[PDB]
Each structure stands twice: as structure tokens, then as C-alpha cells.
Design a protein around this ligand. Structure first.
Ligand code: CA
Length: 121
């Protein structure tokens, strides 16, 4: 019947996107980068997802295709950016952009959430 899953927190996405961008830009293979981000995670759910994303990458699927198994986590814009890097041979640069993006999203969202709580109480 019906299913419903939620995404991850804005700081959680900011962390894994920064970590992945750091690793890929350093020249490490994508599969190894995904393993490092998973094994460095404090969050079981994020660990499990990245193992699953990695598993598809090792079966030959693109990163963008693989992230599409978690559309509740990585929205269409995020996955399009990934696809454009992969298509063009600029996966490193796009991940850097997405990491800056995810960090700016976390800051603005957290500021707004905090402002709501401060004022309400
Ligand atoms: Ca940057």
C-alpha cells in the first residue's frame, strides 16, 4: 500500500557532501570515497545509505543514478548537478559546488528554525 520516508537533516547532508567532495577532489576512486564517508559517519541510517549507494556504484551505476535510490534524501536538483558533472568529466567541481550549496542551506535553515523557536518562547 502506502509508504513514506523522510530525508536527512540539513547539517547531515552538509557533512557527507563536504566529506565526499574533499575525498573525490584529492584523487581517490569514487567507490573508496563512498566507503570512507560511510565508515566515518556517526549516523547508522546515513552509513547504511552510503553502503547502498556504493554498492550500486561498484555494480557500474553512475553516482547520480545511485543517489536516485534515495530521492527523499537527494532532490532532483542535487542529482541533476551530479549527472552534469559525470556527463562532462567534472564530478570533482560539481561536488565542491554542491558542498558549498549544502553548507549555505544548513546555515540559512538553522538560522530560520532557531529564530522561530527564540521568538515563540
Ligand atoms: Ca568551496
Amino acid at each position: 500500500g502506502f509508504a513514506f520516508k523522510r530525508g536527512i537533516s540539513t547539517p547531515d547532508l552538509a557533512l557527507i557532501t563536504r566529506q565526499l567532495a574533499t575525498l573525490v577532489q584529492s584523487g581517490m576512486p569514487l567507490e573508496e570515497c563512498l566507503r570512507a564517508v560511510a565508515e566515518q559517519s556517526e549516523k547508522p541510517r546515513i552509513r547504511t545509505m552510503l553502503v547502498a549507494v556504493r554498492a550500486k556504484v561498484t555494480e557500474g551505476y553512475t553516482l547520480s543514478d545511485s543517489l536516485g535510490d534515495y530521492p527523499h534524501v537527494f532532490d532532483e536538483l542535487f542529482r541533476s548537478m551530479v549527472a552534469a558533472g559525470e556527463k562532462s568529466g567534472h564530478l570533482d567541481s560539481v561536488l565542491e559546488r554542491l558542498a558549498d550549496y549544502a553548507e549555505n542551506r544548513q546555515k540559512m535553515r538553522s538560522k530560520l528554525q532557531q529564530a522561530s523557536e527564540n521568538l515563540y518562547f
